[PDB]
Every structure is written in C-alpha cells, then in structure tokens.
Design a protein around this ligand. Structure first.
Ligand SMILES: NC(=S)c1ccc[n+]([C@@H]2O[C@H](COP(=O)([O-])OP(=O)(O)OC[C@H]3O[C@@H](n4cnc5c(N)ncnc54)[C@H](OP(=O)(O)O)[C@@H]3O)[C@@H](O)[C@H]2O)c1
Ligand SMILES: NC(=S)c1ccc[n+]([C@@H]2O[C@H](COP(=O)([O-])OP(=O)(O)OC[C@H]3O[C@@H](n4cnc5c(N)ncnc54)[C@H](OP(=O)(O)O)[C@@H]3O)[C@@H](O)[C@H]2O)c1
Ligand SMILES: [Mg+2]
Ligand SMILES: [Mg+2]
Lengths: 415, 415
C-alpha cells in the first residue's frame, strides 16, 4: 500500500543510448533524511527551485516527489521498514533522485542504508568533488590549491559485507578451509578470530576507471591518479592499479611518459595531454596536504575513497558542505554526505551546503548546467559575504550568523 | 658463513621479567639501509654517540654491530639474500636494533622487507609518535596542536598477506568455496576477481590495546582513542573496537562516562582519569586536522595505522623526520620511516631527522632517558635555529642550508 504520491503535473525522465532525456517538468524523487534532514532538505528544495526558475525563466520546473528510507520510513511504512522495496523501484524508474542524511539503526543487523542503496541499485561510482570556496575557514594554509574530483569504486572491496564473527561456526569453517585446504599459515591467531573477505574484479575496476577518464576528458581535467595500497595487497589493490593503467592503454590510447610508469592520454576534444599516474594510499594522504595542486581526478577503491573524500573535505573547511553523488548505468542518487546530527534537528541551525551542492551536481547531471551554475555562484557569493551558518561563523571574525533557512536565502540572494 | 662481526668490547642486553637489563656497553645491531641510508645512518651514529657520551660522562658507550637486510644484504650474502636468517636471529638475540630505509625488490615476490621483519619477529606494536618541532614548515595553520602517539597493530589485518590473483586456480577455488559452501552472494563480479583475507583476533587486538593503555599510564597521557571502521567491517574492525573497550574494563577498571560509550580509566600513579573513546576512521582523518588537541594516544589496526601515521606526519611538516619503532615481547626494531630516495643517495643531502628520532626512541626504550632527552633538545634547537636540510630550507625564508652530516652536527651543537 504505497504512501508515495506521484505528482499530477510532471513527467518521467527517460534514458536512451546512455543519454538522459529530461523533460521540462521532470519528476524527481527525494528522501527528506532523518535528523537534520528536516532542516537542510527544505532549504535545498527552495534553492533548487529558485535556480531553476531563474535559469529557465519559468519554462522548467521540478515536480518533487517524496519517497522514504531510514527512520522516517519506519514511521510511514511500519516497524521494520527501513528501506522499502518501493524506494529502490522508484529511484530506478525515475532515474535521478536526491537524499538527506539517513539514520541506520544499531543492534538490528544493518551496516549502512547508504551502502545498501548504492549496492542494491548498482551505483558503482561514488563521485565526490572537493574544491575550495573563498572565505571558508580552513585548518590549512592554502586550501585554494585543492580542486580534485574523487571517483570512488562503490560496489566491491571490503564493503561487500562478507565476514563472520570470531568464534562463530562459520568463521571456524572458513578458517579451517583456509589453513587445511588453501594451506594458509599466515593467520597469526586463528582462534577467536574474525574474518573478512576483500574482492576486487577486472570488470568492477574498469567500469570505475573508465568513468574517471571519461570525466577527465569531458571536463578537460589535467590528470587521473590511481590511488591504491598495491605493494601490500598485490591482487586486489595492486590489480586495481594495473587494470586502471591497462584500461587507459587499451581504450584511451594511453602512451608511456618517459620511462614509465605514468601514461599520457590525449584529450580528443582539446588536444590536452591528460596524465595517468598512481600514488600509494598512505603517501597520498600526505600528498594532498603537501602538494595538492599536483592532483586532479582521483580513481580509487571503496575504502580508500571513503578515507580520501573525508580527508579532502576537512582540509578545505568543507566537512559540512561536501557534495556527493552515487551514479550507475541506469540511475543516480545524490546525497548529503554528513550525518543526521540529531542534537540539532529541527533547530534550523546546521549548514545546508552539502545537500545544496549535491543538488548542484544533480542539476548538472540532468544537463541543467545553467541552474547548476547559479547555485555555485550563489554559494560562492554567500560565503564570500560572510553571511554563514554557525559552523562557519564560530571559526570566523566579523561574520553574520545565519540560520539554515536564512543561508539558503543568502544563496538565492547571490545568484 | 656469517659476515657479521661481534664487537670485541661490548655485552649483550638481556631480558628478565619483561624488563630489559642494559649494560654500560651494550651491543646494538644496526642495518645501514639502502639508498640514502648511506647518508642518514652515519649521522645517526654520530648524534647518538654524542648524546650518550655527554649524558653519562663516558661511563656508557654503544658497541654498534652492522647487520644486513635489503639490497646491501644481496651484495654481502649473495644474489637472493634480501633477508638473511641470521638477521632475524641477531635482532632477537641482542634485543634492541635500528635500521635505515630498505629496498624491497619488485618483480620477485616480496611485499615489503619492513613488514617481513615485523611479522617474523612478532613485533606486534608499530609505535609512531607524532609531535611538532617549533620552526618546522607545515602546511597547516596550527601544527603545534598535534601531540599524538600511534599504536598500530603490526601482526594481523590485511597485512597478513593472504590473497590470490584474479583468474588463478586458487582464487577460483576460494570463490567457489565462498559461493557454494558459505552461501556468499555478495561478490559483485566473481569472474576475473582477486580475493584477499582480513583477519582480526581477540588476542592480537588485546595485546596491542594493552600496550597502548599501559603507555598512556606510564606517560600520564590524557586519552586513548580506538580508531576503526567498525560500522562496515563489523567482525574485524568492529570487533577490534569492542575488544579494546572490553580490555579497558576488564584489566584497567574502565568505567562508563555518562551514558557511554566512552570510559574513564584511573591512572594508578597520578590519579588522572584517562578517557577511552573511539572514532570512525574516515571521520578521524578529519578530526586530526580540525580538532587535533582532543587526541592523544591512538590505538588502531594495521592498515588504518599505516594511513593515520602518514597523515599526521604530513601535517606537522614531519614527512622526513617521523620516528618509528616496532616492538614485541622479546625484541624491538627502530626504523627510519621514509623511503630510500635513491636519486639523492650519497649526496649527503637528505634529512637524517627520522632515523635520529627513531634512535631517540631506542635510547628511551633502553632506559637511557637522559641521552634521549639530549637528542630531543638538540633537534629542537637546530630546527629553531633554522639551520636545516634542504627539505625544510626550501620551504622557509632566512634559513641556513645544511648538509645531512652538518644537520647531524647542528643537533649535537644544540645539546
Ligand atoms: N548509524 C548511523 S546513522 C551512522 C553512524 C556513524 C556514521 N554514519 C555516517 O558517517 C558520516 C558521519 O556521520 P556521524 O553520525 O558520525 O555524524 P553526526 O553525529 O550526525 O554529526 C557529527 C557532527 O558533525 C557536525 N555536522 C554534521 N552535519 C553538519 C551540518 N550540516 N552543518 C554543520 N555541522 C554539521 C556537527 O558538529 P558540531 O556538534 O561540532 O557542531 C555534528 O555534531 C555520515 O555520512 C553518516 O551517514 C552514520
Ligand atoms: N620497494 C620499495 S623500497 C618501496 C616502494 C614503495 C614504498 N615503500 C615504502 O613506503 C614509504 C615511502 O617510500 P617511497 O619509496 O615512496 O619514498 P622515496 O621514493 O624513497 O622518497 C620519495 C620522496 O620523499 C622525500 N624524502 C624521503 N626521505 C627524505 C629525507 N630523509 N629527507 C628529505 N626528503 C625525503 C624526497 O622528496 P623530494 O624528491 O621532493 O625532495 C623523495 O624524493 C617508505 O616507508 C618505504 O619503505 C617502499
Ligand atoms: Mg565516509
Ligand atoms: Mg606507510
């Protein structure tokens, strides 16, 4: 008994030849989000509607359709309905959707609803661009040097969720198999030992890296860096790196730079030579602080991508305004990347910048680049004006403190 | 046919009741290290001898004994001798040793000689303190707020080196077992798929965390933070966190703070209440930049520790002066934490600060705290004086450029 209401006015986005066909009146599902979702989502809807209205002079308008996942879903659909099958169907059917932060319960056997959405819908790209907005308080000296785009593999790695508890019958069965059938002698303590499995495939790797290189081409970026810990994990992380370079050679004409191992890929549109290179993951966490200007598009596995995107967001002062998308071949889900911060829920206090910039990505994904540009311009102006929410204000001198809703308005005021 | 020469003058350190018994004339094995090892090691020997001479007025003296691992070992012992069994025996027998950076070959089937040393000798603690030295050029605004000590688990995690290549008979055998016998359906692409195993045990976890809490007590530190990605890896990383808290409760009288989950442990010597807490790994990489003063002793698994120690070293401008130890119940191996940087080898150019501060840790481990304090004082003075090696100098104005050897001398000059 669906409680979703399909908008009377509005038409479904469709997909033909890997190209989105977006009508003037697209229906866009949104999940409000739990906790501060109640604050940031209304601000997002208003900012997006204003950008769309202004950009296309009223010719285009989104028909927002609320759908459910998280604690709110339990209130709507019932007790154990954290992720209704209907939500998976609707996101796939309508092609483009956006969500606030989600509450995943503890003590009931769910790792992460965000991860569940990504995997169930096969949204294999976690796309997280990290740039600096002039005027943002930052813990680093030169945050303006950071302008990167993270392509985080979203469907494999240790995120597969394949593991067994220490002392469980299953764990002991796996360990026995490893020691006795596979001849494994490297388990230091085989008793009271939890076990996890890390898969990495050629297909999984290459579809991710393919998207990263296509993005570098489409957006005239300077380089793609494969980040990995392949010196220790030779057959997963090392394989990821090798397959990435191979893909560049086989599909994009990548040629050896000097004596290797870096490659150059010719941008078929601009003639720019895009560098394909690689950095070991621990060293990369140093490089993003010490030589940020040398990095651009980043391609990495699921866990590394999780870490890198957080580290980069922190350094640009963007912990609360970091945008994110999850993109697959059939649909895409844009998301606030911060948590539910329930202590502030309903106080109209927190920064709606993250979900707003994820909506910017959404508009851009829809081909509505003018509306997207207006959001960027608005965000830039508001931050430059020092008219900001508490999280920025408390780190600044001479700023004007704005509520969440009010910061949404300041963004519009600056379009 | 050993090519190691046991010093005529000198006596073996011994171990009784988990307490080192260090004579006035201890024999200390050292590995010179490959590449820039030839530059930084001589500087380390000179600085350490000066600190020891000055601290104890000639009553004490180290008898250095060269031992081998890495490319130099192949030159001494022969073609495929990258890690002679003799070196493992000698480090265990003499209890305390130090090494420069090592060349691990590529294309011959060795992940890392550093990891091999750690695992073979069961040096389950990777101890990496990260502090700021006034005057060091840093990419962050307030590096002085960083004063942490990393306890990185050194014997388990994905470092166990258990994995199989995509398309290999073994990989397919493991995957078949997983899908057919374990009923695993979560492998997105089971073909052309590499597989790695991640173990985490109660014993492995608790011996690491035990050392971290004992350290916090011995050194009157403020808190121990368990860092993990337990929300996704419930039975490895999540288990690590749970066992860590449990250890604090069961062995150290840890009591609930407020409504949890943090605990307080009473320092039995100073009565200080040590906070035991936890942070998810991605968030922690933000916290170390945004709220560094809130963190002190860190306890984490092998891979997370690898990443965290690099990230912290970068932020204090200490990429080339980060000290490190590997400690087990029977012996300890102190190490330069940077690479071999062969392009500079023999030019007397690079920073010997890392191996020098690892030697400071070594002296402190030996109970020679006065000599260790002299090295710290010397390092602080030299850096404050802006008499520094090229890696610092190029980031500063009005500094005096010193050779590697000369910086070693400046450290002595400042004792
Ligand atoms: N079971 C669940 S739901 C769970 C558990 C762990 C992690 N996560 C995930 O991991 C990430 C972090 O989540 P979390 O739960 O650890 O964070 P939360 O507890 O929800 O938020 C922690 C702090 O981040 C700051 N913050 C978050 N959003 C903000 C905004 N829009 N404006 C200003 N400040 C903001 C606030 O800092 P101050 O209080 O200092 O102002 C807040 O107290 C999220 O992606 C989340 O989905 C989820
Ligand atoms: N197969 C081997 S041996 C291998 C491979 C990968 C990683 N690792 C390990 O991973 C870590 C990093 O090693 P790596 O090989 O990637 O680094 P390296 O190539 O050996 O060094 C890279 C750069 O770091 C800087 N640097 C290193 N030591 C320095 C010092 N003492 N003073 C000043 N600058 C210094 C230099 O930067 P500038 O040129 O800019 O001045 C150097 O070019 C090490 O722990 C290493 O053991 C080992
Ligand atoms: Mg994350
Ligand atoms: Mg490392």
């Amino acid at each position: 008994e669906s409680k979703v209401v399909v908008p009377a006015q509005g038409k479904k986005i469709t997909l033909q030849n890997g190209k989105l066909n977006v009508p003037e009146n697209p229906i866009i599902p949104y999940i409000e989000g739990d906790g501060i979702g109640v604050d940031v989502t209304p601000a997002m809807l208003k900012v997006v509607d204003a950008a769309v209205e202004k950009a296309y002079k009223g010719e285009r308008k989104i028909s927002w359709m609320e759908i459910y996942t998280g604690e709110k879903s339990t209130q709507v659909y019932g007790q154990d309905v954290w992720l209704p099958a209907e939500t998976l169907d609707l996101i796939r059917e309508y092609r483009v959707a956006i969500m606030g932060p989600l509450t995943t319960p503890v003590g009931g056997g769910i790792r992460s609803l965000n991860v569940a959405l990504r995997q169930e819908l096969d949204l294999y790209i976690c796309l997280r661009p990290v740039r600096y907005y002039q005027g943002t308080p930052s813990p680093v000296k030169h945050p303006e040097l950071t302008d990167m785009v993270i392509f985080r593999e979203n469907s494999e790695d240790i995120y597969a969720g394949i593991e067994w508890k220490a002392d469980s019958a299953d764990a002991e069965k796996v360990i026995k198999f490893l020691r006795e059938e596979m001849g494994v002698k490297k388990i230091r303590f085989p008793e009271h030992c939890g076990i996890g499995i890390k898969p990495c495939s050629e297909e999984g790797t290459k579809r991710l890296v393919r998207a990263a290189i296509e993005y570098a081409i489409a957006n005239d970026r300077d380089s793609v860096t494969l980040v990995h810990k392949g010196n220790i994990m030779k057959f997963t992380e090392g394989a990821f790196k090798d397959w990435g370079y191979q893909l560049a050679r086989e599909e994009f004409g990548g040629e050896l730079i000097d004596g290797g191992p870096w490659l150059k890929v010719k941008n078929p549109n601009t003639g720019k030579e895009i560098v394909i290179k690689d950095v070991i993951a621990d060293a990369f966490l140093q490089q993003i602080l010490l030589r940020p200007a040398e990095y651009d598009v980043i391609a990495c596995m699921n866990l590394n991508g999780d870490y890198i995107s957080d580290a980069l967001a922190a350094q640009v002062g963007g912990i609360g305004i970091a945008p994110g998308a999850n993109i697959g071949d059939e649909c895409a889900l844009f998301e606030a990347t911060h948590g539910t911060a329930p202590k502030y829920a309903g106080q109209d206090k927190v920064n709606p910048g993250s979900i707003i910039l994820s909506a910017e990505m959404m508009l851009r994904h829809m081909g509505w680049t003018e509306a997207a540009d207006l959001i960027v311009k608005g965000m830039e102006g508001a931050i430059n004006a020092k008219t900001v929410t508490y999280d920025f204000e408390r780190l600044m001198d001479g700023a004007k403190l704005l509520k969440c809703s009010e910061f949404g308005d300041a963004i519009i005021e600056n379009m």
